Design a protein around this ligand. Sequence first.
Ligand SMILES: O=C(NC(=O)c1ccccn1)N[C@@H]1O[C@H](CO)[C@@H](O)[C@H](O)[C@H]1O
Ligand SMILES: O=C(NC(=O)c1ccccn1)N[C@@H]1O[C@H](CO)[C@@H](O)[C@H](O)[C@H]1O
Ligand SMILES: *Cc1c(COP(=O)(O)O)cnc(C)c1O
Ligand SMILES: *Cc1c(COP(=O)(O)O)cnc(C)c1O
Lengths: 808, 808
Amino acid sequence: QISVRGLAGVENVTELKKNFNRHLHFTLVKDRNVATPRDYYFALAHTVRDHLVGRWIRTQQHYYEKDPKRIYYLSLEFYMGRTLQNTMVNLALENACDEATYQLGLDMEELEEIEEDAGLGNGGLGRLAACFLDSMATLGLAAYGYGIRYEFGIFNQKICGGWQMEEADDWLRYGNPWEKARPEFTLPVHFYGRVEHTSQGAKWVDTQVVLAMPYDTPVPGYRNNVVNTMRLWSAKAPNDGYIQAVLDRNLAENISRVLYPNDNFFEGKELRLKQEYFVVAATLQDIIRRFKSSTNFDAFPDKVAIQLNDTHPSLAIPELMRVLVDLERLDWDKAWEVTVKTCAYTNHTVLPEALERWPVHLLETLLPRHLQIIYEINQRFLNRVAAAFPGDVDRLRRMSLVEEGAVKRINMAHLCIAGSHAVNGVARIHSEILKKTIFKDFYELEPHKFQNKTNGITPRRWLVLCNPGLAEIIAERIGEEYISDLDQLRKLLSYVDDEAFIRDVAKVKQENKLKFAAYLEREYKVHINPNSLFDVQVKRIHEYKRQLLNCLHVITLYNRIKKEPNKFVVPRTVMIGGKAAPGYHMAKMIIKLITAIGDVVNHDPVVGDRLRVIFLENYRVSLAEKVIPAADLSEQISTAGTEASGTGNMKFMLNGALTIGTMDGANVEMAEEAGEENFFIFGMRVEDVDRLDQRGYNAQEYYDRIPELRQIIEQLSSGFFSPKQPDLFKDIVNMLMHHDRFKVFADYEEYVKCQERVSALYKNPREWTRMVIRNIATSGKFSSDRTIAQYAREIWGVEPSRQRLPAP
Amino acid sequence: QISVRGLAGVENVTELKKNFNRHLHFTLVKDRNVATPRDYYFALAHTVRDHLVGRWIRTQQHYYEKDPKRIYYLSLEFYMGRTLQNTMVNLALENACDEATYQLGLDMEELEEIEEDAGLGNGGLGRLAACFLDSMATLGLAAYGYGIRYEFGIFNQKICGGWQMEEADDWLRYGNPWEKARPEFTLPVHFYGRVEHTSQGAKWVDTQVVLAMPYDTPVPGYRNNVVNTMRLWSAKAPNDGYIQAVLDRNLAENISRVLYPNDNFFEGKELRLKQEYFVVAATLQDIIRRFKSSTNFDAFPDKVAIQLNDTHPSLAIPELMRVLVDLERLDWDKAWEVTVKTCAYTNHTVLPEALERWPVHLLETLLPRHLQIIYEINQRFLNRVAAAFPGDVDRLRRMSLVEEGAVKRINMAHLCIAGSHAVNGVARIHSEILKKTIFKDFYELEPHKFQNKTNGITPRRWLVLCNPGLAEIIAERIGEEYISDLDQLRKLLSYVDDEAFIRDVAKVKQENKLKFAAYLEREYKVHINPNSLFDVQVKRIHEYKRQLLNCLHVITLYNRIKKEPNKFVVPRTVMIGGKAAPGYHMAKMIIKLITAIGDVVNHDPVVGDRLRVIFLENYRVSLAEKVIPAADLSEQISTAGTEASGTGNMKFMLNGALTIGTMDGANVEMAEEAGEENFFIFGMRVEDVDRLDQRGYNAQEYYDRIPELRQIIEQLSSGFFSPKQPDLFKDIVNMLMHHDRFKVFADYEEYVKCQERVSALYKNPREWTRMVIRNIATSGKFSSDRTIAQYAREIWGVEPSRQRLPAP
Ligand SMILES: O=C(NC(=O)c1ccccn1)N[C@@H]1O[C@H](CO)[C@@H](O)[C@H](O)[C@H]1O
Ligand SMILES: O=C(NC(=O)c1ccccn1)N[C@@H]1O[C@H](CO)[C@@H](O)[C@H](O)[C@H]1O
Ligand SMILES: *Cc1c(COP(=O)(O)O)cnc(C)c1O
Ligand SMILES: *Cc1c(COP(=O)(O)O)cnc(C)c1O
């Protein structure tokens, strides 16, 4: 049908049809009389999977022969979403499969909807890992993603009476056609026990053993015949009254049972610590085994790079030391040199409550040898600090890996910096903040360690897959090369005054909005006006992300309409979605508030279809692929200095939405690339927040001086949005008035004014679209291909390649 | 190579090779450079499985079109063993696959050894179900086996210091290529809750829900293109702080976790009750659904037969009543008529400690509606007893389904008889004992209900598969038709004086013994003399099976040798094997005794290779297939009246061993078929046991009057067989002397004398072999094809058919 989806050749279509029928018969054990749509999905998935296999085997064989430096990306989260369409895109099979299925009397799009999301992540950090795997394969790097195969991913969110309910995400129920179990490569992981000191070094004995069984998933590069591996570990009990002993095997296997959904607040739970060590110990054994199958660990850093996705796999540092010292019998200093040159650490937040600080007593019981190694690392590190800054006793306590207090804790971030040759933030402003504030002491000691690597997204999933209409109109003008070289989008600037292109851009957006408007009715029974401005804020629910500020604007628009009903206003559909961490009370209250506002606004006859407020249920990767292409306005309104980067922001920019946002995280670089004239920038900068903190933030001041703000708080307090429970939102009002860490009121005025300017531009479709073109055209920097090339050259010491491997 | 293994045609071999290579590549994601023997096994298994699929789909389609009466075999145990070779045999693919694998440079026999046993049973009852499935498919019956997919089957037995250790049987670790998960046919099962009475009947409310997910395994008939289904249910939690709720799903899923290994003593554990209801509730829903997919339940018994394998699925009776009365709204009397005509019950023991008597309080909590239904069944049943035997108040209490006492219990056997149109024992003597003793009252009320169905074994697994050498020499003389018509073996009587055949029979036995002798060295590092008489007792360890009597004979032979060292004795290898239930202390002591005897006997230089005592570790179906063809003497020495049938006895008879045995279970009919002159029959008959019980059994009498017996007990007591722990076997001596329910001493003299007669015949190879031929030739009655044809005609009301379905 469309050019970017590849050729539908006579031989390929015929071959796909017959392999489809073979799988339906032999693999699923069905015939056309009993087969359900789910059966058809699986037959197609198996058919597409077959095309990966040859390439997968020869890619790994190629790495064995060429022996390049291997990249190991360690993460507790891989937020993969669906695999079928992505695989078709990367193999150039989409049109052929669409044709083959059409001839069998099936709709491929309908079959795609059957696939479960692989929801093995919370949000941005997990999705970054997924985009990174795609880019590493596309750039021909010998890269492996290592994590945990959770049998339950991020919970499915149900909204019941306006409240979030959590439901188990049983994503493996019907099977996963993409993974291959590798029980033959099972490895032991040790827990508890105690340390003995012999004449020949320390020995970790009397341990409990849990088995780590790998499952391999193929990661295809974009049309280069490269297929890399994501290896996820599953926990298994070893085989050695009777009934209870068998039933107690569950305790060992609980390690890989469920993803921790708490992305706001560090909890210090033993099971989470077990998960972190489990992935680290199994992965490092696998790495060392592969390295030996090429005795001298001097070349270890020449052949291995380990990237730590936040501090979650930070135990890699003392585990590598443990193996090198205790098992390989290397001396401390040489083992340390190897460890530092091998490891690199990526930080994803500056918020102190999110930072991992493990109680010493927990590490003492679970990982006694690792604690001893951490103490030794700390002693030697502090000796270096003391020699560099003699007499600076406070610096010593500030930089210690061991934090003092009621409970002694290990600061995992300090451990990561000490044991890594590179530390990076995820956007320029974030990386600067690391050097100036939370890691200032470390920067002063080792300035060379600190880098920036601004985040990106893959344009395969986030343009070609989810927005084929836009990908096509772009390809018509500038060809197809931009898909793996997104900087080529700049060529679109010479079309900003092209009347045909302006019309095509706006048409693609309109089609996307109608498509999503119909999706909302068919699956959720909600009616929206597709002519309205689609105002979208989708991301996890956090106080810092300021969904509450959005809520205040919504109520402001409603109150203005009620005050002057017969005045024209630009119609809006305000959509907010995202999950709240199960333990986060305030975030759960925020969801309730959103739905409560919707209940009043959506049923006011005076409002009509001029304003609609919808809470987008169960926001996840598959939903993002639908809503983002449909959006007109992207809300990126975190308090300056709090969102390390954001990546949702980049997805919207690539897909033809304009951005209203603060100068926070990657928003700064986005505005810089597009030009500030082409962004809706408002609010305090980082410096303004700092000034207000020195003064002391007093919310009462804003309440007293802004009558429109006062009215909203009075409505919240009095029970306007909750007639049956008048004090329902007292916690929210209290926080806003007395305990607001994120200064919602301080940005309110400028936010509302800026929103008026958005409405003004939307009244002029031609000038709106021209600004959109200026955004899409400058979004190239935010490809994860760029990000990964920077990691490769500046951290891992490897060269990317767009050259294809020979096709089987 | 050999005729009975089928044709190895040029096209079939070429096709098998290419499909093997396809699976290795696409299914296993391997190439010849990395592939292990396990990979090769799986590639072959998938290749063979492909040949089943077409036949499986068209068999089920055939049943849909023809709508025959369906047979549902309900069992908590299916002891299947390995599937690969059995499938090749039944599809006539063995030679073709042997050739195909040979040309790929692989040994098929070596690959067969990689397959895990499906050990979903304890012993005879579980293996009977497996043989029955094979025969039902071979006889063209529309039959379904229903059970539980345990993730852990019968434990693997390790012997450590002479003691049994239990190891979890993780049979699914590497995957099961034979099963097909059917998550789309998942059904809810209810537990706990309470009963409400509305105007319109009873309602079971506030229940806990566990999901039942089916897994289907193909059951191929012997060369008739019939492929039936074994459906096994797996427990799943429904999808609806947070972390713990997810982890607690294990509690629901524990239902299908592990097979109860206690085959000696009923325990009354809640988890076992849950397992029993789980299989019953899911199965009955499936049956009713299939019946409706053909409103009037009058025809239900015309289209459905449910066979209860012991009382384990007895809840089928009140569950069917529950569904018909509470859900379908049929009146009680009509529902009862349908239930009785649908259900039939098979009893497998007379030992009172094995009989299921569930505490009322357990049923009250777990299954409150079922208890109410059971009480109502009981009331109406006792009203019939009272009308038939007026004034007989003791009969009323004896026949009650409710047993009185400290704890009230439900007698599940009484429930089964009341609710079934047919009750059968498993051998003629057993069925008679049921009518005369434990179910005498029920027989007097309803004589027409009581039947015999003598057990059998499948000659596919138990001759063709495990003893191809013997199957071939038989086929040379009488053709191949006997394999599905075992009565044809009688034709072999005209070869009893044939010198060529005598030589061939003895040669096949010698080859089997050398094969097994080498197996013992290669896998267990034990040396045996292949010229010795192979004296074998393999079966679960129970007091009633009298492994202890065998032990006494062994010690007698040892003591006789030590007394007269330079006298000639027929050399013997005495092999004993079998598992003890984990809680059965005496059975565990018996295993220790056997190994302890071996430790003394096997290392006595004066004995040499004239006597060897070996404990066969981890006895299971795959081991049975090896040892039985190698045996010369089969030990079937249970106290008369205690072994309901036995089936191991039949396996040995078919494979060319002579039998030393009591007149118990099926031994009686075996001797009858072969002639008593051709069996080594000894010991008390049932009547003799009864006479001794009236007198009172005094073991001291035997100890006082038999000097050889006295010496053995003195050796046991003094610590002759346990020098370091002199009183190790005091429990055994105490039981034998004071508390022996099974009268070991009473059969000792005749046993030893009879064993002398065995040794005498073994000295004359020609006459030994001629007696063997007389046994093999008359073993036809003991085919499960005969057994199943009798069930079909006399209980289920269906006609068997040897006619083949058209090949795809
Ligand atoms: O998503 C997360 N963390 C978590 O999900 C998380 C999970 C467990 C504990 C702490 N945390 N972090 C996000 O990472 C993205 C990628 O760099 C950035 O764009 C976002 O600015 C950042 O908030
Ligand atoms: O094997 C068993 N029971 C068990 O395994 C068992 C399991 C649980 C509870 C009670 N029991 N029973 C056996 O059944 C065979 C088939 O009819 C007969 O040949 C044997 O004589 C009989 O002992
Ligand atoms: C991109 C993405 C995120 C990250 O969004 P931010 O706005 O950067 O927090 C979270 N969840 C999903 C499903 C995503 O796709
Ligand atoms: C046949 C068989 C049995 C039954 O043997 P009996 O001697 O009849 O108790 C038990 N276990 C296995 C593995 C069998 O094959």
